[PDB]
Amino acid sequence: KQFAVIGLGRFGGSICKELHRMGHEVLAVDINEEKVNAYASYATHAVIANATEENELLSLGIRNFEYVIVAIGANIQASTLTTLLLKELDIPNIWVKAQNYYHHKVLEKIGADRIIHPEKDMGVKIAQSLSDENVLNYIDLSDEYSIVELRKLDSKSIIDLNVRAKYGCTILAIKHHGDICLSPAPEDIIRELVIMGHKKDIKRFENE
Amino acid sequence: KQFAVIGLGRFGGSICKELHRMGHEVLAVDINEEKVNAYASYATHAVIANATEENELLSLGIRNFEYVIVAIGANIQASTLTTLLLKELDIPNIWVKAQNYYHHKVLEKIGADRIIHPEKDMGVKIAQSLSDENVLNYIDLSDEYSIVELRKLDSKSIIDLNVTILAIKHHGDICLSLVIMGHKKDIKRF
Amino acid sequence: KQFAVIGLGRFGGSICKELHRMGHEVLAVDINEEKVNAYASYATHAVIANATEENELLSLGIRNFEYVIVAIGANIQASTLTTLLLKELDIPNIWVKAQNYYHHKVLEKIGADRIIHPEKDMGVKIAQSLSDE
Amino acid sequence: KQFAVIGLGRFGGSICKELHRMGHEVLAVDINEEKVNAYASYATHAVIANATEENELLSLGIRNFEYVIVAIGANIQASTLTTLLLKELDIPNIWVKAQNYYHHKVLEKIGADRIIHPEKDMGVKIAQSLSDE
Amino acid sequence: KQFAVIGLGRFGGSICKELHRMGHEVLAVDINEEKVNAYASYATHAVIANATEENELLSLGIRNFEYVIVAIGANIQASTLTTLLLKELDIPNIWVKAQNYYHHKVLEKIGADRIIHPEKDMGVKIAQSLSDE
Ligand SMILES: Nc1ncnc2c1ncn2[C@@H]1O[C@H](COP(=O)(O)OP(=O)(O)OP(=O)(O)O)[C@@H](O)[C@H]1O
Ligand SMILES: Nc1ncnc2c1ncn2[C@@H]1O[C@H](COP(=O)(O)OP(=O)(O)OP(=O)(O)O)[C@@H](O)[C@H]1O
Ligand SMILES: Nc1ncnc2c1ncn2[C@@H]1O[C@H](COP(=O)(O)OP(=O)(O)OP(=O)(O)O)[C@@H](O)[C@H]1O
Ligand SMILES: Nc1ncnc2c1ncn2[C@@H]1O[C@H](COP(=O)(O)OP(=O)(O)OP(=O)(O)O)[C@@H](O)[C@H]1O
Ligand SMILES: Nc1ncnc2c1ncn2[C@@H]1O[C@H](COP(=O)(O)OP(=O)(O)OP(=O)(O)O)[C@@H](O)[C@H]1O
Ligand code: NA
Ligand code: NA
Numbered sequence: 001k002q003f004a005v006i007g008l009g010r011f012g013g014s015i016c017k018e019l020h021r022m023g024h025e026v027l028a029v030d031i032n033e034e035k036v037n038a039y040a041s042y043a044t045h046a047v048i049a050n051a052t053e054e055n056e057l058l059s060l061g062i063r064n065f066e067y068v069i070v071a072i073g074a075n076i077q078a079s080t081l082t083t084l085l086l087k088e089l090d091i092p093n094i095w096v097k098a099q100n101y102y103h104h105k106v107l108e109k110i111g112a113d114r115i116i117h118p119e120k121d122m123g124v125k126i127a128q129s130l131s132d133e134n135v136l137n138y139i140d141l142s143d144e145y146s147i148v149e150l151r152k153l154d155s156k157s158i159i160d161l162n163v164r165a166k167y168g169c170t171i172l173a174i175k176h177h178g179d180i181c182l183s184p185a186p187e188d189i190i191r192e193l194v195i196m197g198h199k200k201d202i203k204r205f206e207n208e
Numbered sequence: 209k210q211f212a213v214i215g216l217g218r219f220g221g222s223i224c225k226e227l228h229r230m231g232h233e234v235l236a237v238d239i240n241e242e243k244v245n246a247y248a249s250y251a252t253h254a255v256i257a258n259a260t261e262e263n264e265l266l267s268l269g270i271r272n273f274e275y276v277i278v279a280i281g282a283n284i285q286a287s288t289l290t291t292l293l294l295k296e297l298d299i300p301n302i303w304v305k306a307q308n309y310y311h312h313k314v315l316e317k318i319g320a321d322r323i324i325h326p327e328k329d330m331g332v333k334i335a336q337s338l339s340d341e342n343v344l345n346y347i348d349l350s351d352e353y354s355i356v357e358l359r360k361l362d363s364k365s366i367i368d369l370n371v372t373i374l375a376i377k378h379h380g381d382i383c384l385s386l387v388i389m390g391h392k393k394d395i396k397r398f
Numbered sequence: 399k400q401f402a403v404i405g406l407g408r409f410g411g412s413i414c415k416e417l418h419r420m421g422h423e424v425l426a427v428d429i430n431e432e433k434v435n436a437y438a439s440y441a442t443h444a445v446i447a448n449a450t451e452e453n454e455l456l457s458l459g460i461r462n463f464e465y466v467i468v469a470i471g472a473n474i475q476a477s478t479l480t481t482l483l484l485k486e487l488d489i490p491n492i493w494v495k496a497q498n499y500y501h502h503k504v505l506e507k508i509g510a511d512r513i514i515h516p517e518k519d520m521g522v523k524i525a526q527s528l529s530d531e
Numbered sequence: 532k533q534f535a536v537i538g539l540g541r542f543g544g545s546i547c548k549e550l551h552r553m554g555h556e557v558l559a560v561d562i563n564e565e566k567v568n569a570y571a572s573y574a575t576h577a578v579i580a581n582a583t584e585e586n587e588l589l590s591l592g593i594r595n596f597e598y599v600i601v602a603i604g605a606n607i608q609a610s611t612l613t614t615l616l617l618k619e620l621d622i623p624n625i626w627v628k629a630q631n632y633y634h635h636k637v638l639e640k641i642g643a644d645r646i647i648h649p650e651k652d653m654g655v656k657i658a659q660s661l662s663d664e
Numbered sequence: 665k666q667f668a669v670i671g672l673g674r675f676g677g678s679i680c681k682e683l684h685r686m687g688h689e690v691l692a693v694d695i696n697e698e699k700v701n702a703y704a705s706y707a708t709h710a711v712i713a714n715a716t717e718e719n720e721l722l723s724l725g726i727r728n729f730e731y732v733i734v735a736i737g738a739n740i741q742a743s744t745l746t747t748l749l750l751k752e753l754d755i756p757n758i759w760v761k762a763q764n765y766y767h768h769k770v771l772e773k774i775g776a777d778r779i780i781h782p783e784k785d786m787g788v789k790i791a792q793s794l795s796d797e
């Protein structure tokens with residue numbers, strides 16, 4: 001697996017450092033010299049290049065990468081022309097960071113395999129946490145079912161609450177001072193909690 | 209619950225639209241007139257103001273909001289001075305979007321209740337998906353346990369494999385009691 | 399002792415010249431090449447560096463200085479990030495030139511040992527002289 | 532008495548606030564609109580004007596002030612032409628904020644009654660404190 | 665004799681070409697690289713330097729010139745600090761190109777031996793020709 005990350009910003013630079021940490025060959029490309037110097041130690045290869053130029057793109061041997069990530073999300077012209085070149089160069093997987101809804105529509109027309117909205121996805125997740133302070137993190141399995149990680153419940157056993165049949169929801173795990181429990185069989189004392197169930201049913205448990 | 213979102217960018221604008229959709233009173237503040245006009249329909253109140261000025265901050269009645277979100281993540285001076293003013297104004301919860309590690313350190317000194325790295329958090333999650341194409345989405349319960357949503361497994365019963373399987377998705381149908389929960393090392397084995 | 403003065407302006411350059419005149423080892427740091435050349439003869443060591451970068455800060459042996467004076471008073475971002483790095487490097491004394499009241503509050507949060515208002519302090523003394531002349 | 536402060540910076544603004552606090556009639560002049568609005572409440576009269584223009588200077592009744600303080604210390608051209616106009620208008624006392632040694636010499640030639648170095652004077656006091664701490 | 669012309673504009677460059685044509689040693693100084701290259705062949709010595717810096721002025725051997733012509737007529741700060749430095753280095757004759765009436769007064773205070781108004785003087789001759797044509 002050889003990965004190319006084009007554009008070293010907050011999003012693109014984070015991908016380079018994480019992939020390099022996992023032990024992958026990463027080519028970091030950016031048009032700004034200061035960015036490339038900073039990430040020269042966090043990538044296998046770091047090049048100062050303009051990704052909108054076909055000659056510079058071919059000078060990098062970009063055809064040797066299965067995955068190319070275009071992490072340019074504030075320059076629509078630079079973002080769309082880069083992915084147009086990569087599609088012309090027959091890159092199998094092209095993942096692009098989109099700016100707005102109109103940028104997303106263009107990238108879908110010119111063939112971006114995956115389109116990413118980092119700030120928009122995080123903003124929705126943060127806004128869910130703001131609305132319900134109990135909700136610490138959640139993953140949306142579907143449009144009606146989700147897994148949500150959450151003093152009345154304190155000193156209460158699992159068998160004490162019958163939300164297993166009352167709400168049709170299952171308690172996946174409970175965190176006890178840095179200790180996790182898998183398949184918690186009642187009864188277990190709840191101290192001052194991961195649950196999977198229907199989205200409406202989960203809200204019922206938070207109420208009671 | 210009254211929420212104030214300061215700075216209407218990709219991150220701040222997303223919070224305003226989502227909170228407004230859920231039916232909450234949102235005050236959208238931005239120094240750019242074009243941004244405020246765009247989000248005037250996605251907020252209860254939209255104001256063109258400089259959040260680094262105390263007089264403009266008081267003109268908004270910012271003390272009436274329990275939650276203020278400072279979504280300025282490319283202007284460190286504007287971000288840190290805004291949160292310094294809000295802390296001086298005794299706002300209970302101040303959530304700030306940080307730019308880098310040094311910006312994160314400053315905001316922790318001047319008392320930001322929660323510090324958010326939107327692009328950095330997404331970049332780590334995207335990089336996990338790049339490394340393993342099977343991994344579609346995941347939530348890290350701990351540093352050793354996580355829930356990961358994922359042709360050899362095709363036409364194979366659950367009892368056929370003796371490897372907990374939380375749920376399986378069947379053409380838009382979910383079953384309760386491929387989503388698996390287990391140890392991080394053990395998940396890689398599967 | 400050894401003094402490091404970061405930012406060679408009217409206030410920072412005046413500290414270097416006075417300390418160097420008194421016979422002290424002074425390290426002069428400025429991001430502007432022209433400033434460093436001017437103060438090369440007025441400092442024991444003059445370096446062109448960006449104080450907001452940790453690697454450049456460590457290249458100067460900044461840990462060897464008991465006193466570091468941050469004399470950037472118009473760039474709040476450069477001033478606050480410099481003293482944040484110096485606080486991390488466990489510098490005993492950090493004296494910073496503040497721009498306004500809000501800059502003073504930020505520096506007090508991030509551990510500036512002493513905060514200086516050169517123009518504001520002089521402006522009060524001049525105003526006192528004007529009133530009672 | 533009546534004081535006119537031209538240039539609302541860190542040094543000029545500090546003079547206006549201190550004099551206004553003591554209960555004196557202060558005219559605040561600055562070419563920047565944002566500065567004048569900020570100091571509108573801290574001065575008896577705050578005007579947006581260019582002090583290098585004689586017509587704008589006469590529009591303010593600058594002849595009515597015994598003391599005029601020119602607090603422009605980074606623009607040598609604006610500082611020296613202002614005090615040249617004030618000297619022509621026969622202002623009794625003109626106090627000017629100098630930038631460097633050469634600016635001090637020019638102002639002394641064109642009749643600045645008193646020349647002030649805020650950052651340089653504070654930098655010597657700070658350096659004395661550092662040496663004997 | 666030896667002439668130094670500082671500032672290669674329409675007026676300064678015309679002096680260099682005419683003096684060099686007459687067979688005189690002319691030192692051409694300009695802060696702009698493009699101007700110096702253009703007048704490299706029209707001067708005995710052409711240097712890219714900032715005339716407001718004393719060290720750069722001494723690097724040129726400016727004390728060896730009896731006549732120095734300061735031909736900066738749109739930058740009052742650069743024009744007045746140059747002739748202030750030249751007056752300090754004891755240049756016998758300093759001829760300066762003035763911008764307006766106020767610039768003329770400043771240069772007369774800081775010891776400009778002769779002050780020239782090229783456009784103003786030509787504008788009067790042209791106006792005389794227009795009236796009586
Ligand atoms: N043509 C180009 N080729 C390569 N890199 C480029 C090009 N144009 C811009 N970049 C770089 O891509 C990076 C990301 O672009 P930019 O900063 O505009 O986007 P962004 O959406 O604000 O980023 P992020 O949110 O990830 O910080 C920057 O470092 C920029 O210098
Ligand atoms: N002082 C300020 N007061 C209010 N709003 C401000 C201020 N400074 C900037 N903003 C606004 O905040 C928003 C976000 O700022 P900016 O674009 O610098 O951050 P960002 O990290 O690039 O944002 P995002 O990634 O969410 O798009 C912009 O709409 C900008 O106009
Ligand atoms: N990141 C930096 N690292 C080092 N020096 C810097 C940095 N940023 C600015 N400087 C220098 O610090 C000096 C002082 O900064 P600045 O001119 O902005 O402040 P000031 O308040 O106007 O200062 P002064 O009143 O002392 O003249 C300048 O010479 C500037 O070039
Ligand atoms: N021609 C002018 N007329 C009036 N005010 C002016 C003029 N030129 C500049 N000023 C103002 O004078 C003030 C001080 O000038 P400047 O910022 O250049 O000096 P400084 O040495 O940095 O000052 P300080 O150290 O007091 O902050 C500024 O608010 C500036 O807008
Ligand atoms: N500090 C300086 N040292 C040397 N040369 C300088 C300096 N500042 C400006 N000059 C040069 O002096 C020349 C004349 O200056 P400028 O163009 O501002 O005046 P001017 O009145 O428009 O002149 P002219 O009418 O002769 O064209 C220019 O070539 C300019 O680059
Ligand atoms: Na962003
Ligand atoms: Na100053």
Ligand code: NA
Nearest residue numbers: 674675737783
């Ligand atoms: Na001309």
